[model samples]
Target: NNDNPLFKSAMVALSLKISIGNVVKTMQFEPSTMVYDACRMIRERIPEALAGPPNDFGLFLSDDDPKKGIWLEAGKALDYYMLRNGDTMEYRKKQRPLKIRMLDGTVKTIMVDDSKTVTDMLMTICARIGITNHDEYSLVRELELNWLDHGRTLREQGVEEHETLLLRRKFFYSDQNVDSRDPVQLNLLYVQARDDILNGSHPVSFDKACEFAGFQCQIQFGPHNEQKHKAGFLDLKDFLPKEEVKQKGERKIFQAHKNCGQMSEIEAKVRYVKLARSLKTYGVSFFLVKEKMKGKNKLVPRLLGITKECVMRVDEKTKEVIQEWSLTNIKRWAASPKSFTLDFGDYQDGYYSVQTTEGEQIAQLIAGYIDIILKKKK
Candidate 1:
């Protein structure tokens, strides 16, 4: 055995493949090498593209399936993992600390590794904030405003540490079995709705704004104490949507609050949600699109609002509902990189096409909503 060159080579060093992006290099490692040592070696010989220090990169071992992989623990030796000669491992940049800000303005920090998936991150965040109904919430990278999809690692999604994440409601399901008494969930939902209203993202009518302000007043000050609740007692920006507050004035809202009957905190939450749910734009995610107008020769920029039940074409500036198509009436939809088409009507002959760069995202979102409705059917 000592005289055999192959045995000498095998005993002295093992060869493995380390990949960065699509580039793979056969790296030699001593039999007793640890994962940290491998990381350093990979870092030292990295291409000009990767410039981070050793700790910024990590070693991941996987089967033939690329979708699933685990970051090799740095403390473990190659022998501990039983890494065979010619085995392949991925060398990917590690994730730094991530900050998750909830709608209630609660921010929590969590460290994500290369292998940590979105599902894992959500669970961690929910646990930190005592959110039991985890599925009802989702995370968005705030700066980019990119919705993080489940089943993908943070690193795989190119999520940066600097990008703050916000946990917002995934969808508003009226028939959800969530506990209304759950303080954390109730507060979160209210906070999100409040933020949406104040930002004028969720447009409400003047009368509707007054009603919402009444419920909000009840929630905060408890049944409008005349001494405590006067003209200046409630902030106009806090009670009404931004656009309305600027011009509509707060007289109607103040009167509405004065007229609001006595209500418990939970009851106020329930009332606020009941009214908020009736709005046309509630629970809708809007995408910017260039749609071919019926009477116009040119395409017009519009907002395509996707909700659980239907898709609505909204005026971009006016925020008015122009048209709608329900999921049951919709026959099919298809998307390319540049455009998406939806076929609807009883005979499926009617179709609407819109040009948008986010065609894939729109298509997937529609598919997801369809899946939810499909599940509801059974």
Candidate 2:
């Protein structure tokens, strides 16, 4: 009778240590219990994770490195992972390392937890990326359209594991704020702006490109040495857009460099930033959206730009400003996952709506900008 099926089944009853924080509960489970059921039981019995969403919390086989250990699958049975009678499983918020793409097209990984807010994640990213001034930057979704909401948790925002995010500068406050004194902040900003300028992402005319090349010359070659700064002295293509360089030539860039006066490295950078600020696209975060036609089901593509003081709609190709809504005039706005709507005008009579995946991002951006701008007014 010792080998009887009922007696053998009773002998296999498992006592598991389900630990969260400092508390560990010795829980009873059957070897046939599904991992999902164990997790559900833990959530039911555990007070710390009881108030949390079911999916947000998970059971880990070990509390050590998440990358090395196993994240128990909900579909598999507890015995599937070779469970024993006296084993431990962690009951904590699900965490994963997410890859972040930098401004220079480099990738870095940061660990993110379900309990971490957007700002908390940003702080970690900023620390790793050497960004001293966090206010000037934000994490952008892969398509360069949506921004992560700084107020919400990663789980609530639905940030998936291994999702790539671009670390980008989203806010350009008044002149005082844009002209940052921190070396790290200034260098990162300059590098990002420089890359955009060179790649033609930030549109600039021939003359402006030439001026930018001249600043580059001053910064690199240092005060334009007549001996070292001759024809073929610099790669003009590196400074100006390929289209601009091909259309004109490198000779003109050399001439522009020749004309640049004496300046220190910092001075040259400051000048470059000063001119960059004057650009129409400078410090303007644009979101691509479809405008719902008044009486038709047709959707028109429009570029919505968010700047320091106002929101401007621009043409798709021409980038010509179509309309402007000053920050002061924007009465209120609301956003869902798919669309954003704004209420503006003197009496708050105007209304505008656009369809985009970045609705939450745009809403948060505008709100943050308003807070900054308003505080500056005082």
Candidate 3:
């Protein structure tokens, strides 16, 4: 009596169409039918063809506009949710929209659709963020942790059904060339960058200049001479101007007139150091006082230090001696480029009357430094 046909009829069976791709099946079920009943009907048509148990996919109200559909839960009674007889319910694999987090802490949302694969979503995010590396990352379902296949559908990877999956992109940085980690090479370049700034050859058309206030307080070097060795690498083997080197112990003075003069190594070194530091102090003052666009350099005289070889007005609060010239060898100075004609020190490279007032002064100091430098055959 409990299995009577009349009781079955009164329980009220419903009619529904289960749609997946172009395939459609009309199914019969009772008011107590679960969403799983429709899913089972879909799989019954092609047992092996449908990849999972009927519950792996979900059913959505087949409204013409996908944007306006209600999703049916597998365990819920369809009689409570299905709107009408012969209504079409889609067999879509269930996947929730995924939230992706960026390194900068921004979040982007990507919705998984039955029509799209993991690779499709992968490129969509990359394009949205302006990153061109499309193939470098993969999506891994969170918690369950199974990597969804590149070629699989939302239905096959356990999506399009039930409460689907959460996910994240697993990415790899490309350092495969194995270059940036080398210390020796990196240090060499580190020194090179400082050299560019020091010599002022570096261009600054773009200045977010937070570093040193546009070289405001930093020491600057003049244009680097290729003939001169770079910092720390400086050696005596490099070409020293024959015009300045002295013969024997007699030093090269402005008045020496000949191409060369003589002086002890000690005297020349001392003269260069004192004169170098003196002008540098003045050079700092020269720019700040005049408010001009020029830089200064290390304290070695031009002939010795490969630094700027120039001068400015009186102002050496410090003292340095070359053990000789007194006021005697110091006849007054001539300013002819690098000429020492009392009014003109002979032509010295970078001595072409040089650009600034500091330049003229430095040239004059060189002569005074040389004049005081005493050298004799003794």
Q: Among these predicted structures, which one has the highest TM-score?
A: 1
Positional deviation of 103 in candidate 2, in angstroms?
13
Clashing pairs in 1: none
Q: In candidate 1, what are the lDDT values of residues 1-378, reduced to their tens digit?
A: 357544447666878888888888988888678888878787777683266665677887866554445678888888788777898988877665678887667887876654677888888778877889887887877761476666777655666446678888766566333347687777767776777766766766667777788778778887767676665656677777766774345667666766777767787776677667767888787788998867999889988988877889887666679888787777889999799998875655557898988777778788888887887889
Candidate 1 Cα errors over 4 Å, as ranges: 1-137, 149-158, 162-169, 172-192, 218-234, 261-270, 288-290, 297-303, 314-322, 335-339, 345-350, 355-358, 374-378
Residue range 1-378, candidate 3, lDDT tens digits? 356554334237777777777777776777677777756766767444286654557787866654355667778888888456678877776654656666444665655543456677667667767768665455555441344655555444554334333334331112111234554543343333333333332211112111211121111222223344233332211211222122321211111212113433233323232322233221221210111113645332321111122333321122121122222333344443323322223332222222333334433345534533443212
Give the root-mean-square deviation of each candidate in angstroms. Answer: 9.5, 9.4, 27.9
Model 1, residue 4: C-alpha shift (Å):
28
Q: What is the C-alpha lDDT of each candidate?
A: 0.75, 0.74, 0.41
lDDT of 3: 0.41
TM-score for candidate 1, please give it.
Answer: 0.59
lDDT tens readout by residue for model 2, 152-240: 65444555565788887654444333454676667666776788788765766677788888888777877767677666656667878
Q: Ten residues in a row with the worst lDDT in model 3?
A: 203-212
Error of 2 at 378 (Å): 9.9
Question: For model 3, what is the alpha-carbon lDDT of residue 167?
Answer: 33
All candidates in order of TM-score, best leading: 1, 2, 3
